[PDB]
Design a protein around this nucleic acid. Structure first.
Ligand code: CTP
Lengths: 50, 120, 250
RNA sequence: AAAGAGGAGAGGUA
DNA sequence: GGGCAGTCGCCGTGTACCTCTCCTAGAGCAGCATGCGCCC
DNA sequence: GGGCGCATGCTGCTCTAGGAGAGGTACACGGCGACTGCCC
């Protein structure tokens, strides 16, 4: 209902695609391990949807 | 060939199960080109029983590790690390960034001289 | 404090997470007591093993315990003189730190101790009557926590010795050394550094330091207070017609 | 001659 | 260079007494008593 | 039908182990000392 409030977050944090977002999620959730799109998808699915 | 030898840490008394499960998984996944052969080296040694006779039974030379010949790639690493009764690879440990617990272990192959020595 | 290094570097040399340069040799970038890494050590190994010249300075970089060697190279008198000279031309928080180090050094001169004694080669074992086994349970036996830790230490030591005897590859031996160090640490003080050893149920075991520590430790339970013989206890009622120095006993 | 060993939970009385 | 200010981890938190229960580890391997099939 | 031989479920001896999380997580509150950030 107030889209101009989220614009600050979008600007100061940058934009992501699906694959880039998944890679970032893997990077921050599992430090050290090599990032992978399928891996991050697996963490998301096993976390909030299984 | 880029297939190198690595050592994998497994559970106690769970090496035959790990070998069978890993070979079955790699066969059923059609990934036999990445992972070639797994092994548990053994050696028969005198095993003197109640009397003076030696049973000469086989015992493991590395009780707790299994050897794997494979090409180290990301996907094959993912399949290997997901096998049950497998703790982690053997290599160079790394410092955990934040919090407690273990870090990330970078695998390291056995040198040609060593792998020659173990394999007679 | 003695080695003049941050705690993180010392903790990384132990537990097999980094290398340390014990001898710079005739190199231009290497320094004494310099932390290295696996990739960097690989680069220096490639440089030295290229069969080239000017590098025959015997570079000794050993990533191990490697603390006994660093503590054996200390000369107390020379360092004492150097610190005393350097104290005067300093001020502020820079001075105080040096002062601290000086303190410790002079201690090791007063007691005529060796700084390398902080690394252990032999381990004492307590008498068996202070850790009883107990023969209840009909057919089973009672649980004592010191025995489990001693057994784990002995098992790891025997495995490491057997592996070292048959000339195993030197990537499996370091694993056994790390587990032996962790086992000894758990025996001495449980949970001080890393994870805690857990018994049957998710309940931590009792180490040697947990026997003398707190309100239920030896000091505050068995030495400053005791149970006694020739004692009784009972309910009290009111007795009139008594004298102020008298009491009634059943 | 012999005879109890510790530990962990839950609930009470001044 | 010189810090302020902020953050993270370790230490500590009254005294005596009474009763009830559950647990000393858990999985592999071989011995054994039982059930069922077989040949006369 | 009946004695005998083999398969099999039940159970006790043994040993060994002992690693590492799986997740049982997020969960008190104050005081003090030891690092680290981002600026003047
Ligand atoms: N947590 C507690 C509770 C009680 N007590 C002891 O028990 C007494 C309580 O006495 P009680 O008979 O319960 O109450 P009184 O205050 O004496 O009042 P009254 O007898 O009139 O009811 C306290 O004073 C104290 O000596 C204590 O030490 N600690």
């Amino acid at each position: 209902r107030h889209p101009e409030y989220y614009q600050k977050t979008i600007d100061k944090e940058g934009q992501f695609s699906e694959d880039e977002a998944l890679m970032e999620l893997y990077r921050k959730l599992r430090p050290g391990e090599p990032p992978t799109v399928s891996g991050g998808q697996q963490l998301l699915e096993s976390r909030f949807f299984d | 060939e880029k297939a190198r030898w690595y050592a994998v840490q497994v559970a106690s008394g769970c090496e035959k199960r790990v070998k069978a499960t890993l070979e079955q998984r790699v066969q059923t996944l059609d990934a036999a080109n990445r992972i070639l052969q797994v092994e548990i080296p053994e050696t028969p040694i005198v095993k003197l029983k109640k009397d003076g006779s030696r049973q000469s039974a086989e015992e493991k030379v590395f009780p707790g590790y299994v050897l794997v010949r494979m090409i180290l790639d990301d996907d094959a690493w993912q399949i290997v690390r997901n096998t049950p009764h497998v703790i982690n690879f053997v290599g160079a440990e790394q410092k955990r960034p934040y919090g407690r617990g273990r870090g990330h272990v970078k695998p390291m192959p056995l040198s040609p001289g060593e792998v020659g020595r173990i394999f007679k | 404090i003695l080695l003049d290094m941050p705690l993180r570097d010392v903790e990384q040399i132990v537990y097999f997470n980094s290398y340390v340069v014990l001898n710079p040799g005739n190199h231009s970038e290497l320094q004494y007591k310099q932390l290295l890494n696996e990739d960097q050590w690989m680069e220096i190994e490639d440089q030295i093993y290229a069969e080239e010249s000017d590098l025959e300075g015997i570079e000794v970089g050993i990533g191990a315990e490697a603390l006994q060697q660093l503590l054996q190279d200390l000369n107390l008198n020379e360092e004492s003189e150097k610190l005393r000279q350097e104290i005067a031309e300093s001020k502020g928080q820079k001075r105080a730190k040096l002062i601290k180090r000086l303190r410790v050094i002079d201690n090791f001169i007063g007691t005529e101790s060796r700084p390398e004694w902080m690394v252990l080669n032999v381990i004492p074992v307590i008498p068996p009557d202070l850790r009883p086994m107990v023969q209840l349970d009909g057919g089973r036996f009672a649980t004592s926590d010191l025995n489990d830790l001693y057994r784990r230490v002995i098992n790891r030591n025997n495995r490491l010795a057997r592996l070292q005897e048959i000339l195993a590859p030197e990537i499996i031996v370091r694993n056994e050394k790390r587990m032996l160090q962790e086992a000894v640490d758990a025996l001495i003080d449980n949970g001080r550094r890393g994870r805690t050893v857990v018994g049957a149920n998710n309940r931590p075991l009792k180490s040697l330091s947990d026997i003398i520590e707190g309100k239920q430790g030896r000091f505050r339970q068995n030495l400053l207070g005791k149970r006694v013989d020739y004692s009784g206890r009972s309910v009290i009622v009111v007795g009139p017609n008594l004298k102020i120095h008298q009491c009634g006993l059943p």
